[PDB]
UniProtKB/Swiss-Prot annotation, chain A:
Lineage: Eukaryota, Metazoa, Chordata, Craniata, Vertebrata
GO cellular component, one term: zona pellucida receptor complex
Protein keywords: Acetylation, ATP-binding, Chaperone, Cytoplasm, Disease variant, Disulfide bond, Hydrolase, Intellectual disability, Isopeptide bond, Nucleotide-binding, Phosphoprotein, Ubl conjugation
Binding site for ADP: 27, 79-82, 147-148, 396, 467-468, 482, 487
Noted disease: Neurodevelopmental disorder with speech or visual impairment and brain hypomyelination: An autosomal dominant disorder characterized by global developmental delay, impaired intellectual development, poor or absent speech, and brain abnormalities including hypomyelination, cerebellar atrophy, and optic nerve atrophy. Some patients have severe visual impairment, dystonic movements, and seizures.
Function: Component of the chaperonin-containing T-complex (TRiC), a molecular chaperone complex that assists the folding of actin, tubulin and other proteins upon ATP hydrolysis. The TRiC complex mediates the folding of WRAP53/TCAB1, thereby regulating telomere maintenance. As part of the TRiC complex may play a role in the assembly of BBSome, a complex involved in ciliogenesis regulating transports vesicles to the cilia.
Protein's recorded name: T-complex protein 1 subunit gamma
Pfam families: Cpn60_TCP1
Swiss-Prot record, chain B:
Amino acids binding ADP: 29
Ligand binding (ATP): 29
Residues included from the entire protein: 13 to 85 of 543
Gene that encodes it: CCT7
Signal peptide feature range: none
Disease: De novo genetic variants in nearly every subunit of the TRiC complex, including CCT7, have been found in individuals with a broad spectrum of brain malformations, and clinical phenotypes ranging from mild to severe epilepsy, developmental delay, intellectual disability, ataxia, and other features of cerebral malfunction.
Modified residues (N6-acetyllysine): 55
Protein name: T-complex protein 1 subunit eta
Curated annotation (Swiss-Prot), chain C:
Domain of life according to the entry: Eukaryota
Keyword Lipid metabolism recorded: no
Signal sequence coordinates: none
Biological process annotations from GO: chaperone mediated protein folding independent of cofactor; chaperone-mediated protein folding; positive regulation of establishment of protein localization to telomere; positive regulation of protein localization to Cajal body; positive regulation of telomerase RNA localization to Cajal body; positive regulation of telomere maintenance via telomerase; protein folding; protein stabilization
Keywords, comma-separated and alphabetical: Acetylation, ATP-binding, Chaperone, Cytoplasm, Hydrolase, Isopeptide bond, Nucleotide-binding, Phosphoprotein, Ubl conjugation
NCBIfam families tied to this protein: chap_CCT_zeta, thermosome_beta
Entry protein name: T-complex protein 1 subunit zeta
Species: Homo sapiens (Human)
Modified sites of kind N6-acetyllysine: 188, 276, 354, 366, 377
GO cellular component, one term: microtubule
Disease cited in the entry: De novo genetic variants in nearly every subunit of the TRiC complex, including CCT6A, have been found in individuals with a broad spectrum of brain malformations, and clinical phenotypes ranging from mild to severe epilepsy, developmental delay, intellectual disability, ataxia, and other features of cerebral malfunction.
EC category name: hydrolase
From Swiss-Prot, chain D:
UniProt-annotated location(s): Cytoplasm; Cytoplasm, Cytoskeleton, Microtubule organizing center, Centrosome; Cytoplasm, Cytoskeleton, Cilium basal body
Function: Component of the chaperonin-containing T-complex (TRiC), a molecular chaperone complex that assists the folding of actin, tubulin and other proteins upon ATP hydrolysis. The TRiC complex mediates the folding of WRAP53/TCAB1, thereby regulating telomere maintenance. As part of the TRiC complex may play a role in the assembly of BBSome, a complex involved in ciliogenesis regulating transports vesicles to the cilia.
GO cellular component terms, semicolon-separated: azurophil granule lumen; cell body; centrosome; chaperonin-containing T-complex; cilium; cytoplasm; cytosol; extracellular exosome
GO-annotated molecular function: ATP binding; ATP hydrolysis activity; ATP-dependent protein folding chaperone; cadherin binding; protein folding chaperone; unfolded protein binding
Binding partners and assembly: Component of the chaperonin-containing T-complex (TRiC), a hexadecamer composed of two identical back-to-back stacked rings enclosing a protein folding chamber. Each ring is made up of eight different subunits: TCP1/CCT1, CCT2, CCT3, CCT4, CCT5, CCT6A/CCT6, CCT7, CCT8. Interacts with PACRG. Interacts with DNAAF4. Interacts with synaptic plasticity regulator PANTS.
Catalytic activity of the protein: ATP + H2O = ADP + phosphate + H(+)
NCBIfam families documented for this protein: chap_CCT_theta (TIGR02346)
């Protein structure tokens, strides 16, 4: 058990110890964390999710740090390093001084006012990006990839991502919000030429849909969605009687061939030749579709079936009865089998249900495959954020300084006792500028001073400090950009983390 | 595996001998000074010549063992 | 529980510093041989930098990191891994002095980047084209072996290594990945290494002198057993009744009989005369009975050969590996021009040499079966990887720290990128290199400053890569002597040193992990 | 360390100092050894006996060291043990002496690597002047005095009381069956201890000697091929026991009837196959004995492990467990099998007459088996010095009389060459001086006196010293003309291996 003053100081330390090295990793300039094992081995990492999971944290407040980076990772996957830095520095600067007077809830109210202050500044600072022009979105992706530090396979990945995300964009919710990227997938193929990377329609499956018989080419026939119940019944549509006797066996079997026969008949009417069954498909049942002259694909997981349903873009049905061209298989499914290797790869193309695409990636090996696939993963996150909100924000610490003076101006104007927390959130922003100064190797005093001076003359529209040139620089000129939405969400999560942690004033087991 | 060497090592070996030479010191006639040597098997033992009992002793030096062996000879 | 900031950098530099000591007394021929009993208690004799890191017990994160990057270098060149550590250590030392006065790690790193580009372009300028003649291969071969063994035994291994590479041109590989079969012989001296063109076999016949010279050899490499004795088996285990096991014993023995018979029919069909021999190599036994019958027909039959012998035979000889015997044409069987049996030591080794269509040469190392015979094995190993590089590149420079002073001189004088940020790492980069030549002088007993001023001046006047004569530890022209280094050696110390440095330099926390 | 990795127990201070001091302790057991001595070293090991040796091979293997520097030389000594006999001690003292001298060099400011270089040079010059120190050689190997002079040096190294009798004995009993010119066998000569009688009562017997008593009739046929079985009898049927005596009375009748009829068949199979001498390491029952009297087979009651071992090497035999009838496959090269009592104990005598693969036995008679273990060292080294594989063995002065000669030449030669090498060359001279020091220590006087007075007489090639009173004060004895000679080959491998061993161990630092 901890109580009172122990807790406030604890929060700040736990945040802080995670932060020191992880802040440095942000930007093309990346410091590499050593983790030393008891076995005497080494794991070297730049990725925030990896550092956090590996280390042993004893303190419950530390665990809250870890879990908020899970929050971030789930929404984007970039800025994951960032959220704990930001969240830490709110607590350092505000907390201990204002506690002695005693007002916690005040610091919290101030955080969320300030947060709103920052969201509004962003719309002005940012200019629109065309969400159907490839060239303009491309430079943005180019900024994000080089954080990871791969810069060769990256070049391909960017472009393939652009078409993949765009084609899985079609989400309606009355306001036309896009978070859809769940129709998208990466099909991995060991082997072949290193440079054949393309996009093909629907959703393509291989994680358990590699089978020796699948009809080699389908260029017309449909897929028939089923969660049936294609398997026999020993009664009508449920089992009422058991086989344990010679007499029971004989009677029951007649019923079992009938049930199967009427199912296949409702499947064949809408003309398939490739038929998918999630489960409820037996050794006698599959033999019945062969005798129906229907190729059956069977015993393949529920996740694959969700995927194949999305690929034709047609709804599933568990309804065993009268499956129509109108209900299942709606539009055209198509099935291509290529042997890239001597292994069966299944493309399912064509989605009706406006569009859908997934990615072909061909390595020449497993290792070669992986490099592209991660960097493509960064890439389609950007593509998405640009689609979501159609403004692109200038990178680095330029955006941070704009907000830094808006809070100096707001906090003076209001002259509440919220004033001093505003001032602590203004300075919490400045860490990102300090990280970029450190990255070149110049003194913090000299470059921060100049940056502040640029606010006064030109308002830090794009004039920040960049860590790969160690000077004040127009970010637009360099081709340093990032999307608005990524900035907003990183900021968002950091205030939530700062607010929640500050509410813990006592920890009691 | 033990190894020991030296001029004090030589001195050791002789010192062990004295201890067995004392066991048998006098037994020429019937005077000297005995102590009944009773074993851990619960047997009481004396003999008429002191070399007998000496044969039974197991010496933890090899150098001292030579002097045991010539007794047997 | 954390070492942060100054405390994190401190741990890496301290380790590099103790390590450096060890692997300078492995550097060049003037370095010293090392043994381990500290790895497991048993007696190993090894004189390679990568290898020595694996054999020991490494728990320190900085030592371990250097061992991992080492692994890549060791595969490609197998030389310069004695060097890897030395350049890393000094490279850190330089950095440390500036930091302690007051300098950021990141500016150090930038100037490393600038350093690396210039340094690599210097290799390209300074490289001297060589031929692909024997003479020129002798000199890559001799200096690399000289690293890993003595001067005396190394000169013997020089001959063996070079004829193999000439033969590999015939196959038209530009690489080596075959002709690396190292086979050991039982002897009372190690100052012989013999070259055997084809293959060598671990054991020969159990019956000596069947026909121990085969003029015309038709090699059937098989691996089904022609001996399985009188043991009572069923499916290879005991069964409940005696009789059921027995019934199988008859049919199994009968199967063997017919297969021995196929050797008798095969000799007429392929041979037809005893003016030609016939070779059998069975990786499994053959009855003593079966050898006498085969022997009079003028067949040498080998028993208890290995699976490694079999794969090698199939490549070199043009042979087959079959799970049957039967009656097969000579079109299928491989041919060797010569077979000779050479008995030496306590084990006699049947040689099957002058193979047609070879792709495997065997370098036959004689030795007493001590750790010394393992020492020439790992010397010979990396000497093959060395002369492989000479075939890879076109250009081989004179070494002995000749290359390294030349490259250091080029950096000190101008800024490679013209900025002060770069310049702080660049000094650091240049002095790190100087460790390799100066230290050959140190081992020998010749003061280190005196060779630096001389060696560097003579570069300036001439344009010669003047090097070190190892033994005096005084300078001399590395070209004439034969102390040479490949393009790949001087490339791979450069790449390994930069990458390894910048991840330890850029620590800011080391925190323990389960 | 500074590292929690990179394990070493040697290096820095510990390579330079600790390794050398350890070599020095091993080689203390050979600064009481080699030539004239009265030293005895007792070593136990729970062998149910006392083991007395003045041979390096048995001392070394017993003694374990945890450092690679000291452990490595033991292997070099074994190598010289295979190729040659006595001088094993000389290999270890040399390497160990040179290493003490080396450390002093390191101290001054000289580097390791030149010192390493200068030994290879000194070793090459010493071998080159070595066949020019031949002063005497054999020409006939069937002549007992020319062989015995050679033998004598091996024996001497053990005790200085058993030189005369033994040196004659081995040559008398033959190790000259082989030509010794391409081929020699040393597992077809053993040293066979017969307990009982004095050690001047040690005798000549030709071919395989086994102690175990003979039972039954004895053969003298030439159809007698050896069959060896570890256990061919144990009772052909084993009992179980249900009344805790027998299982039971009617069954005991059958167990005995089946043993006697199975043993009849087994022993008749041996009789028929041409095996007319069977070696039993099992137990001779009455039933088994009764059969072998009828077939006419010499029967050897018992054997121990040691006796079985010599049959498998010499014969080309195998020792099979049996209770089901076998046949010949052990075979044998022995025609004749005779019976003769050595030690007043019935001994089995094997013989055949040939050059190659021919057998001999230096057989000993002794009060205890301990006294016979030391004598054995003298004798087995005397067989291993015979091996040179020539009939002109190019004998050089034994007993350490060469040593001072080598030292004088080497020190002068050192002066001529320049650089740092030379100091190692000089040290290389003073390592040979180790041998004259150890002979001085047992003799009872200091080192200064012997080395100076050998040097004083200049080039001689005879001078060495004994345990005597002649060995002390004028410190001059003739060991060319006392018939103390050793072979050129024995001194060659001793010096060669020792220089190689000293260089590899001086290199270590891991």
């Amino acid at each position: 058990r901890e109580s009172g003053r122990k807790v406030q100081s604890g929060n700040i330390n736990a945040a802080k110890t995670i932060a020191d090295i992880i802040r440095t990793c942000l930007g093309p300039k990346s410091m590499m964390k050593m983790l030393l094992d008891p076995m005497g081995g080494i794991v070297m990492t730049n990725d925030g999710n990896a550092i956090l999971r590996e280390i042993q944290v004893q303190h419950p407040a530390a665990k809250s740090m870890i879990e908020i980076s899970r929050t971030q990772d789930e929404e984007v996957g970039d800025g994951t390093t960032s959220v704990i830095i930001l969240a830490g520095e709110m607590l350092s600067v505000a907390e201990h001084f204002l506690e002695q007077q005693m007002h916690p809830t005040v610091v919290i109210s101030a955080y969320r006012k300030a947060l709103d202050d920052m969201i509004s500044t962003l719309k002005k600072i940012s200019i629109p990006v065309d969400i159907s022009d490839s060239d303009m979105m491309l430079n943005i992706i180019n900024s994000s990839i080089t954080t990871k530090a791969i810069s060769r396979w990256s070049s391909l990945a960017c472009n393939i991502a652009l078409d993949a995300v765009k084609m899985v964009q079609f989400e309606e919710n009355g306001r036309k919000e896009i978070d859809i990227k769940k129709y998208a997938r990466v099909e991995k193929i060991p082997g072949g030429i290193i440079e054949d990377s393309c996009v093909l329609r629907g959703v393509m499956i291989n994680k358990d849909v590699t089978h020796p018989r699948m009809r080699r080419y389908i260029k017309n026939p449909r897929i028939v969605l089923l969660d049936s119940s294609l398997e026999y019944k020993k009664g009508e549509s449920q089992t009422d009687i058991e086989i344990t006797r010679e007499e029971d066996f004989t009677r029951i079997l007649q019923m079992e061939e009938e049930y199967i026969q009427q199912l296949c008949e409702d499947i064949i009417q809408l003309k398939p030749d490739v038929v998918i069954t999630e489960k409820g498909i037996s050794d006698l049942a599959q033999h019945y579709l062969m005798r129906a002259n229907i190729t059956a694909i069977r015993r393949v997981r529920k996740t694959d079936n969700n995927r194949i349903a999305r690929a034709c873009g047609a709804r599933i049905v568990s309804r065993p009865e009268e499956l129509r061209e109108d209900d299942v298989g709606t539009g055209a499914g198509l099935l291509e089998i290529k042997k890239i290797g001597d292994e069966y790869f299944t493309f399912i193309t064509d989605c009706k249900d406006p569009k859908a695409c997934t990615i072909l990636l061909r390595g020449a090996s497993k290792e070669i495959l992986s490099e592209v696939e991660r960097n493509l993963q960064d890439a389609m996150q950007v593509c998405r954020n640009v689609l979501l909100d159609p403004q692109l924000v200038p990178g680095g610490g330029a955006s941070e300084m704009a907000v830094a003076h808006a809070l100096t101006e707001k906090s003076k104007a209001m002259t509440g006792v919220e004033q001093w927390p505003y001032r602590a959130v203004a300075q919490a922003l400045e860490v990102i500028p300090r990280t970029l100064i450190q990255n070149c190797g110049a003194s913090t005093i000299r470059l921060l001073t100049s940056l502040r001076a640029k606010h006064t003359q030109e308002n830090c529209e794009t004039w920040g400090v960049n860590g790969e040139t160690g000077t004040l620089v127009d970010m637009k000129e360099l081709g340093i950009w990032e999307p608005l939405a990524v900035k907003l969400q990183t900021y968002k999560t950091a205030v939530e983390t700062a607010v929640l942690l500050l509410r813990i004033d006592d920890i009691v087991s | 595996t033990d190894s020991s060497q030296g001029i004090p090592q030589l001195v050791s070996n002789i010192s062990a001998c004295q201890v067995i030479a004392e066991a048998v010191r006098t037994t020429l006639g019937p005077r000297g000074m005995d102590k009944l040597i009773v074993d851990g098997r619960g047997k009481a033992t004396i003999s008429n010549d002191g070399a007998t009992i000496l044969k039974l002793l197991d010496v933890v030096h090899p150098a001292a063992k030579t002097l045991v062996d010539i007794a047997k000879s | 529980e954390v070492a942060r900031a100054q405390a994190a950098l401190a741990v890496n530099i301290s380790a590099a510093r103790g390590l450096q000591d060890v692997l300078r007394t492995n550097l060049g021929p003037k370095g010293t041989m090392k043994m381990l009993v500290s790895g497991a208690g048993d007696i190993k004799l090894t004189k390679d930098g990568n290898v020595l890191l694996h054999e020991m017990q490494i728990q320190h994160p900085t030592a371990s990191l250097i061992a991992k990057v080492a692994t890549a270098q060791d595969d490609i060149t197998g030389d310069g891994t004695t060097s890897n550590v030395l350049i890393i250590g000094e490279l850190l030392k330089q950095a440390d002095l500036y930091i302690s006065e007051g300098l950021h790690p990141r500016i150090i790193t930038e100037g490393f980047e600038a350093a690396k580009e210039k340094a690599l372009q210097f290799l390209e300028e300074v490289k001297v084209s060589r031929e692909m003649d024997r003479e020129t291969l002798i000199d890559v071969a001799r200096t690399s072996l000289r690293t890993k063994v003595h001067a005396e035994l190394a000169d013997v291994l020089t001959e063996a290594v070079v004829d193999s590479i000439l033969a590999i041109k015939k196959q038209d590989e530009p690489i080596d990945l075959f002709m690396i079969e190292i086979m050991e012989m039982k002897h009372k001296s190690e100052t012989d290494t013999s070259l055997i063109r084809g293959l060598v076999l671990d054991h020969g016949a159990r019956h000596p002198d069947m026909k121990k010279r085969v003029e015309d050899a038709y090699i059937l490499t098989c691996n089904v057993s022609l001996e399985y004795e009188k043991t009572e088996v069923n499916s290879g285990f005991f069964y409940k009744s005696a009789e059921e096991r027995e019934k199988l014993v008859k049919a199994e023995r009968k199967f063997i009989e017919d297969r021995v018979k196929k050797i008798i029919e095969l000799k007429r069909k392929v041979c037809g005369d005893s003016d030609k021999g016939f070779v059998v190599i069975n990786q499994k036994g053959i009855d003593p009975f079966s050898l006498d019958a085969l022997s009079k027909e003028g067949i040498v039959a080998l028993r208890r050969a290995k699976r490694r012998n079999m794969e090698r035979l199939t490549l070199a000889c043009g042979g087959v590996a079959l799970n049957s015997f039967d009656d097969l044409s000579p079109d299928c069987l491989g041919h060797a021009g010569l077979v000779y049996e050479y008995t030496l030591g306590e084990e006699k080794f049947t040689f099957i040499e002058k193979c047609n269509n070879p792709r495997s040469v065997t370098l036959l190392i004689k030795g007493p079966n001590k750790h010394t015979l393992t020492q020439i094995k790992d010397a010979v190993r990396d000497g093959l990887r060395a002369v492989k590089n000479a075939i890879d590149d076109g250009c081989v420079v004179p070494g002995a720290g000749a290359v390294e002073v030349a490259m250091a001189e080029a950096l000190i004088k101008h800024k490679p990128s013209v900025k002060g940020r770069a310049q702080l790492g660049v000094q650091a980069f240049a002095d790190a290199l100087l460790i390799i030549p100066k230290v050959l002088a140190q081992n020998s007993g010749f003061d280190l400053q005196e060779t630096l001023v001389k060696i560097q001046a003579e570069h300036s006047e001439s344009g010669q890569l003047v090097g070190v004569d190892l033994n005096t530890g005084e300078p001399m022209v590395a070209a004439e002597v034969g102390v040479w280094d490949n393009y790949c050696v001087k490339k791979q110390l450069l790449h390994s040193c930069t990458v390894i440095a910048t991840n330890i330099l850029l620590v800011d926390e080391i925190m323990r992990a389960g | 360390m500074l590292k929690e990795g990179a394990k070493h127990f040697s290096g820095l201070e510990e390579a330079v100092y600790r390794n050398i001091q350890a070599c020095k302790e091993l080689a203390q057991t050979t600064r009481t050894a080699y030539g004239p001595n009265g030293m005895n070293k007792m070593v136990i090991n729970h062998l149910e006996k006392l083991f007395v040796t003045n041979d390096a091979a048995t001392i070394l293997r017993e003694l374990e060291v945890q450092h690679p520097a000291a452990k490595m030389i033991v292997m070099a000594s074994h190598m010289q043990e295979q190729e040659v006999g006595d001088g094993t001690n000389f290999v270890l003292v040399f390497a160990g002496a040179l290493l003490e001298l080396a450390e002093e060099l390191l101290r001054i400011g000289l580097s390791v690597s030149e010192v390493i270089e200068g030994y290879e040079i000194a070793c090459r010059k010493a071998h080159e002047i070595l066949p020019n120190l031949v002063c005497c050689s054999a020409k006939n190997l069937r002549d007992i005095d020319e062989v015995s002079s050679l033998l004598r040096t091996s024996i001497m190294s053990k005790q200085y009381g058993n030189e005369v009798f033994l040196a004659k004995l081995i040559a008398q009993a033959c190790v000259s069956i082989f030509p010794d010119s391409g081929h020699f066998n040393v597992d077809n000569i053993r040293v066979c201890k017969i307990l009982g009688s004095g050690i001047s009562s040690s005798s000549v017997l030709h071919g395989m000697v086994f102690k175990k008593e003979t039972e039954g009739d004895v053969t003298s046929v030439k159809d007698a091929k050896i069959a060896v079985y570890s256990c061919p009898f144990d009772g052909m049927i084993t009992e179980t026991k249900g009344t805790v005596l027998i299982k039971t009375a009617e069954e005991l009748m059958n167990f005995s009837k089946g043993e006697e009829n199975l043993m009849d068949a087994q022993v008749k199979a041996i009789a028929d196959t041409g095996a007319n001498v069977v070696v039993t390491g099992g137990k001779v029952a009455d039933m088994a004995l009764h059969y072998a009297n009828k077939y006419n087979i010499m029967l050897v009651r018992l054997n121990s492990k040691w006796d079985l071992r010599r049959l498998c090497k010499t014969v080309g035999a195998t020792a099979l467990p049996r209770l089901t009838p076998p046949v010949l496959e052990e075979m044998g090269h022995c025609d004749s099998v005779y019976l003769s009592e050595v030690g007043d104990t019935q001994v089995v005598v094997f013989k055949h007459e040939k050059e190659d693969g021919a057998i001999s036995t230096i057989v000993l008679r002794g009060s205890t088996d301990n006294l016979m273990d030391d004598i054995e060292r003298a004798v087995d080294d005397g067989v291993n010095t015979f091996k040179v594989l020539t009939r002109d063995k190019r004998l050089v002065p034994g007993g350490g009389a060469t040593e001072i000669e080598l030292a004088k030449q080497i020190t002068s030669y050192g002066e001529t060459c320049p650089g740092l090498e030379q100091y190692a060359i000089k040290k290389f001279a003073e390592a040979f001086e180790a041998i004259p020091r150890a002979l001085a220590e047992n003799s009872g006087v200091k080192a200064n006196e012997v080395i100076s007075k050998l040097y004083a007489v200049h080039q001689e090639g005879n001078k060495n010293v004994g345990l005597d009173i002649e060995a002390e004060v004028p410190a001059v004895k003739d060991m060319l003309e006392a018939g103390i000679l050793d072979t050129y080959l024995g001194k060659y491998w001793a010096i060669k291996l020792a220089t190689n061993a000293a260089v590899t161990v001086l290199r270590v630092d891991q």
